[PDB]
């Protein structure tokens, strides 16, 4: 099954590049916090659960646009399409291994991301982000960010859409594509499209908007304009 094929390839390259980003950003903060503060175990175990929740939607683009690049290098996606298949590979194949794998992050971000850095918060007593449930904003805004963390909670739809729109730049290639020139511009293309998505938070609630469609403001339009 080609669904299982592209799922397994992107599902392993997402793990590899996820290890690259996470196990590099750990050693980012480790060296200078050990230079500042004057036992690496709980240092790494505090660095990791609020990095595997952070960088995974920023590693999906160095997953499904790099492993699929090596997949497209052998001229296999054109044979997929020529054998009777379509744009359905993006949604109905890559999301089949994306939404469980970002479902992992949207479960971790409640289960053991906040409470799992709470043991580091406990270790701050020996040592030298607005992440809570729906009841926090109710008395946070009342006494601002009117459900601005609707995005941080229900990210994975827009996290899907930001690479749904970007993946057409790889399964629509020019064939004169060396890919080390063009998929990096294709990554920097959608790089702002989940960041300027977020910095335009007050841009619609600067006049007042229901946050259901006020925390979706270019995201509902991206897959609208990006169906090919």
């Amino acid at each position: 099954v080609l669904d299982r094929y592209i799922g397994k390839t992107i599902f392993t390259t997402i793990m590899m590049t996820l290890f690259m980003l996470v196990s590099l950003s750990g050693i980012i903060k480790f060296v200078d916090q050990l230079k500042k503060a004057g036992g690496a175990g709980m240092y790494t175990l505090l660095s990791v659960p609020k990095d595997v929740q952070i960088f995974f939607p920023m590693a999906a683009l160095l997953g499904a646009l790099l492993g699929l690049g090596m997949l497209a290098q052998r001229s296999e996606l054109v044979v997929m399409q020529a054998s009777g298949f379509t744009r359905m590979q993006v949604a109905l194949s890559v999301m089949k291994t994306a939404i469980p794998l970002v479902l992992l992050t949207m479960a971790i971000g409640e289960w053991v991301a906040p409470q799992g850095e709470q043991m580091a918060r406990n270790y701050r007593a020996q040592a030298m982000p607005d992440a809570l449930s729906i009841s926090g904003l109710h008395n946070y805004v009342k006494y601002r960010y009117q459900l601005n963390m609707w995005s941080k909670i229900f990210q994975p739809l827009s996290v899907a859409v930001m690479m749904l729109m970007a993946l057409s730049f790889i399964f629509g290639p020019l064939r004169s594509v060396p890919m080390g020139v063009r998929v990096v511009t294709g990554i920097s293309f959608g790089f702002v499209f989940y960041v300027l998505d977020q910095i335009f938070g007050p841009l619609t609630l600067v006049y007042g908007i229901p946050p259901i469609i006020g925390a979706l403001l270019p995201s509902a339009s991206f897959f609208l304009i990006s169906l090919w």
Binding site: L21, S25, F55, M58, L62, P178, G180, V181, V184, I187, S188, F191, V195, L196, Q198, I199, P202
Partner: peptide, 29 residues
């Protein structure tokens, strides 16, 4: 040229990948 091309590619990706967000968080607001 091939190694330098992929070199600049990976450096450009890793030069964006987190601190462009962290510069957005100061400048864009």
């Amino acid at each position: 040229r091939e190694t330098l091309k992929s070199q600049l590619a990976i450096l450009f990706i890793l030069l964006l990948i987190f601190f462009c967000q962290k510069l957005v968080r100061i400048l864009g607001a």
